[PDB]
């Protein structure tokens, strides 16, 4: 029972995603080179990758129905707290179970857990990250469910600093109902089974990954040697 409004929301989010996700990964040539041979050797390349992703996340969030109507302060707060989570979600499109790596076109842009450690992160984060990616890939989400989950993740009213939490919850409830109705009406069993519950559980997992990444980000960023290798956008969004 997907209403025209609900299909319209899906159409907007699908178009927003296709405008902001380049599955050819053509722009990876413009990043600083990945060097695999402190020696945070992958930090230049992955900082540019993450910085590039944040740009796409902002472009996607701006096209979420209702998001652009929020105040600038709330839009900023919502993007700052959700960016790391949306990055983890959108990277699942490139995540592969053949090898538990992120396959972005070529061997140069094939990222395993060694690259996340050569970006400065321990396995306090890498282990839950791979488990999240695997459990998310096993959901075999429709592209419609994938973009709705990203959108729902961004417009969460419980983010710190939100002013119009009821307006944010208004948007999210419409995306939530659209996702629920999409699963009932368009996702065939047995994949549909408890799909909404599993997808919302992934938002809880992302909160934990958000917390672990932040504590590791602040410890990495505290050393100016590492902060020098980040980008200005990364420093603005993730913090100084």
């Amino acid at each position: 029972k997907l209403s025209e409004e609900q299909q319209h929301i899906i159409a907007i989010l699908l178009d927003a995603h296709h405008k902001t996700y380049d599955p050819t990964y053509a722009d990876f040539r413009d990043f600083r080179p990945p060097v695999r041979m402190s020696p945070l050797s992958m930090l230049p390349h992955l900082a540019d990758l993450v910085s590039y992703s944040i740009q796409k996340v902002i472009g996607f969030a701006k096209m979420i129905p209702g998001f652009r109507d929020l105040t600038s302060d709330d839009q900023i707060v919502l993007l700052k707290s959700s960016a790391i989570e949306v990055i983890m979600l959108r990277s699942n499109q490139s995540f592969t179970m053949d090898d538990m790596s992120w396959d972005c076109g070529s061997q140069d842009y094939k990222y395993d857990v060694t690259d996340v450690s050569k970006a400065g992160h321990t396995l306090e984060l890498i282990e839950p990250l791979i488990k999240f990616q695997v459990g998310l890939k096993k959901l075999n989400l429709h592209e419609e469910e994938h973009v709705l989950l990203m959108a729902i993740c961004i417009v969460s009213p419980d983010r710190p600093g939100v002013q119009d939490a009821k307006l944010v919850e208004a948007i999210q409830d419409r995306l939530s109902n659209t996702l629920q109705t999409y699963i009932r009406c368009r996702h065939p069993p047995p994949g549909s089974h408890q799909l909404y519950a599993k997808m919302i559980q992934k938002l809880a997992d992302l909160r934990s990954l958000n917390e672990e990444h932040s504590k590791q980000y602040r410890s990495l960023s505290f050393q100016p040697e590492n902060s020098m290798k980040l980008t200005p956008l990364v420093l603005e969004v993730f913090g100084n």
Binding site: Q55, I58, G59, K62, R68, S72, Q75, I76, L79, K80, P232, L233, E236, V237
Partner: peptide, 11 residues
Amino acid sequence: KNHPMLMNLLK
């Protein structure tokens, strides 16, 4: 703490 790059990316 103020975010001019994020804001101009939001127009």
